[PDB]
């Protein structure tokens, strides 16, 4: 483009792109862990809160959890039998589709699967999923928590986010002196409805963490036996 081209929004940030060096490091780490641990697991965690991820990681200090770009993990595990790092390892790599996810541990398979079945934590609405239950804003002053708890304990919404409510969340809000008020009760979600992006954002703003989450593991690989098993516990 000789001219009339896009201009990059330059900012004086401190962090910089890691580049291919990080990918190479993760590739080497994956190939080392493939032999350093007796068992390999593929964890399909599409999205998780960072504290939850750290809690999962520290749940067993005697294990290593490897994540990052899916393609890098697939290449480390091998894309074809002709170059797979371990026998039948191509099959395990083929099974990864979500935001993986690669756990290396010597712990008993039954213990790990039982822990993953029992482990559960709260999560946001995560749009593109059926809503947990219906929610309606009070037909009056709107509070920070949306009146889920008694209004005496709640606090009025800050005026700063009112433009966000109007333009982004698309709710006919009007500004009062000290409070934000709506003339009619506004329903944000209904039972079984597919959650839209705006509805999910509204729920997150109201802090409705009614949705539960549990990691998804599609299969595990036994290094000693060198055979793939398709355990599909939810």
């Amino acid at each position: 483009m000789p001219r009339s081209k896009r201009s990059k929004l330059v900012t004086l940030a401190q962090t910089d792109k890691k580049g291919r060096e990080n990918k190479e490091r993760i590739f080497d780490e994956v190939r080392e862990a493939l032999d350093t641990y007796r068992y390999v697991w593929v964890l399909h965690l599409d999205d998780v809160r960072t504290p939850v991820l750290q809690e999962i990681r520290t749940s067993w200090a005697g294990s290593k959890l490897i994540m990052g770009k899916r393609k890098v993990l697939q290449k480390a595990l091998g894309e074809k039998r002709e170059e797979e790092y371990k026998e039948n390892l191509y099959q395990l790599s083929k099974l990864c589709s979500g935001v993986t996810g690669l756990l290396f541990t010597d712990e008993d398979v039954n213990t790990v699967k039982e822990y993953f079945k029992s482990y559960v934590r709260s999560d946001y609405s995560r749009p593109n999923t059926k809503a947990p239950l219906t929610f309606t804003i009070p037909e009056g002053i709107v509070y920070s928590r949306g009146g889920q708890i008694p209004a005496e304990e709640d606090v009025p919404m800050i005026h700063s986010l009112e433009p966000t409510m109007r333009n982004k969340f698309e709710i006919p809000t009007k500004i009062k002196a000290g409070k934000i008020t709506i003339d009619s009760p506004y329903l944000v979600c209904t039972e079984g409805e597919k959650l839209d992006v705006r509805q999910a954002l509204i729920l997150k703003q109201f802090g409705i963490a009614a949705s539960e989450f549990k990691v998804k593991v599609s299969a595990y690989y036994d290094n000693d036996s060198s055979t793939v098993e398709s355990t599909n516990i939810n």
Partner: protein, 188 residues
């Protein structure tokens, strides 16, 4: 570099048909019909499978490619308006003097009448463009909804309606009275 030929794909839904002349484009569908004279653009049209139309420019420059892209965008907008339609919601806000809005009729022009804006005695009449219908909202206090098939007509009508209530010579940081487009969406 004067590319030999660049083309773009226009998707025509099964519910509508688009007959095109040398450069005159006509769209027909359930909600209504629209027309546009693109004789000044100098582009070509061609059917492929009765559901997709390819617009191509041979030996066209960068500006010609941009014109092709905007023609495709206009055709897509017309198709969407014919199929789904466009719905514009406008809200008028007042602090002390209530704003009175009514759709008066004289000689069939159907001007939108705004009175008592900021206490002004002048009566502001905004003519209603062709193909756009204006109806006062219900259950949403102080709101007027403009709907139509053509994006340009509805958008221009809304722009004129909001501009007619311009706050002149007063500090905009304090006088919030006016009319604004609250939300843009489809009729369906």
């Amino acid at each position: 570099m004067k590319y030999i030929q660049t083309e773009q794909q226009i998707e025509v839904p099964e519910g509508v048909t688009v007959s095109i002349k040398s450069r005159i484009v006509k769209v027909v569908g359930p909600r209504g019909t629209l027309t546009k004279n693109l004789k000044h653009i100098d582009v070509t049209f061609t059917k492929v499978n009765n559901q997709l139309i390819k617009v191509a420019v041979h030996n066209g420059g960068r500006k010609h490619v941009a014109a092709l892209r905007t023609v495709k965008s206009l055709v897509d907008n017309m198709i969407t308006g014919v199929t789904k339609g466009y719905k514009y919601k406008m809200r008028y806000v007042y602090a002390h003097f209530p704003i009175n809005v009514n759709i008066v009729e004289k000689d069939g022009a159907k001007f939108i009448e705004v009175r008592n804006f900021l206490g002004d005695k002048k009566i502001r009449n905004v003519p209603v463009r062709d193909g756009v219908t204006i109806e006062f909202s219900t259950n949403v206090k102080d709101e007027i909804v403009l709907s139509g098939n053509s994006v340009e007509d509805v958008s221009q009508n809304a722009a004129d309606l909001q501009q007619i209530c311009r706050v002149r010579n007063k500090d905009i940081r304090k006088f919030l009275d006016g009319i604004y487009v609250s939300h843009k969406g489809f009729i369906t």
